[PDB]
């Protein structure tokens, strides 16, 4: 269960964990041991799993291929990947500690991933705003800067990191043009 759980968090849904394309990641509530609290935690985690899935889709869309196009968009995808990286490292460490002690409760995993539980929805909000408005070019640099003054210290740090990446790209541009 736990390994399937993390692999679904790893972007690889299993049999119980079903990924509807726009229905998100959801729980095949069929196991005889599942409990309402169990399923509620499962849904809370499938939230972040769907977030990661959509992140991966977007980044593949606008980093592996050249409206929705330009160096700004590739940099956005790269910085989003970098920001999600510590989430992946935390996931791997949690897997390791489960592989060490089998008496660990899924509640422990939820405790651990609460660090990104709040972080992820803000990032999804930002990226969905960027896509829907089709923000392109240096406008995107302003966009996150608008959101760069947010009230979520975790989200704010992630936004500062991505904004520094954007600053670096546009500094490359400005150095070239100067």
């Amino acid at each position: 269960m736990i390994h399937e759980l993390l692999l679904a968090l790893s972007g690889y849904p299993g049999s119980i964990f079903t990924w509807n394309k726009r229905g998100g990641l959801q729980v095949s509530q069929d196991f005889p041991f599942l409990h309402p609290s169990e399923t509620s935690v499962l849904n809370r985690l499938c939230r972040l799993g769907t977030d990661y899935i959509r992140f991966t889709e977007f980044i593949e869309q606008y980093t592996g291929h050249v409206g929705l196009h330009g160096i700004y968009l590739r940099a956005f995808c790269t910085g989003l990947d970098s920001v999600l990286q510590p989430y992946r490292q935390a996931l791997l460490d949690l897997e390791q500690e489960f592989l060490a002690d089998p008496h660990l409760s899924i509640s422990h995993i939820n405790y651990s991933l609460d660090q990104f539980q709040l972080l992820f929805p803000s990032v999804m909000v930002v990226v969905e705003q960027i896509k829907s408005q089709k923000i392109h070019g240096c406008q995107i640099l302003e966009t996150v800067y608008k959101h760069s003054c947010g009230g979520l210290p975790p989200v704010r740090s992630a936004l500062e990191k991505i904004l520094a990446v954007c600053h670096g790209v546009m500094y490359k541009q400005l150095s070239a043009w100067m």
Partner: protein
């Protein structure tokens, strides 16, 4: 691809340096061919992998030897981007050395490699502008002066 990945920075440096090395390898044979064509004018080659078609049937002592000796590969036309700026210089340099040899009867790949190693981030287009072309300019002017 290398031009499009210049602006990413060192975030994709794993890909950036890989593509740099690959392009260096791919272009070395062209460097060697151009060098041999403009140092001697013959090749150990028999059908070329090179853009400009060679008309080997042009008589040496003939007016169109200045023209027909090398034939542009028009389909529109086969060409490579970084080769475009020096294409004319290449053509005149090679034909000039050929004429000088007619009237008188280190490797550029290595130079490019050492230049790019000394220099290497920086625009690879500007990298090439800085390193590659000056060698061609010097050789072209030297050949022109000798011929004249």
């Amino acid at each position: 691809a290398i031009l499009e990945y210049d602006n990413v920075g060192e975030a994709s440096e794993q890909t950036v340096s890989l593509l740099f090395s690959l392009w260096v390898e791919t272009v070395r044979p062209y460097l060697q061919i151009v060098d041999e064509w403009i140092v001697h004018g013959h090749l150990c080659d028999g059908a070329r992998e090179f853009i400009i078609q060679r008309n080997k049937n042009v008589p040496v002592n003939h007016r169109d030897f200045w023209y027909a000796t090398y034939t542009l590969y028009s389909v529109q036309h086969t060409m490579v981007s970084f080769l475009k700026p020096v294409l004319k210089q290449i053509i005149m340099a090679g034909k000039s050395m050929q004429l000088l040899k007619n009237l008188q009867c280190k490797s550029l790949y290595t130079l490019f490699l050492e230049s790019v190693q000394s220099r290497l981030c920086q625009t690879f287009e500007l990298t090439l502008r800085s390193c590659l072309y000056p060698h061609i300019d010097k050789q072209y002017l030297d050949c022109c002066g000798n011929l004249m």
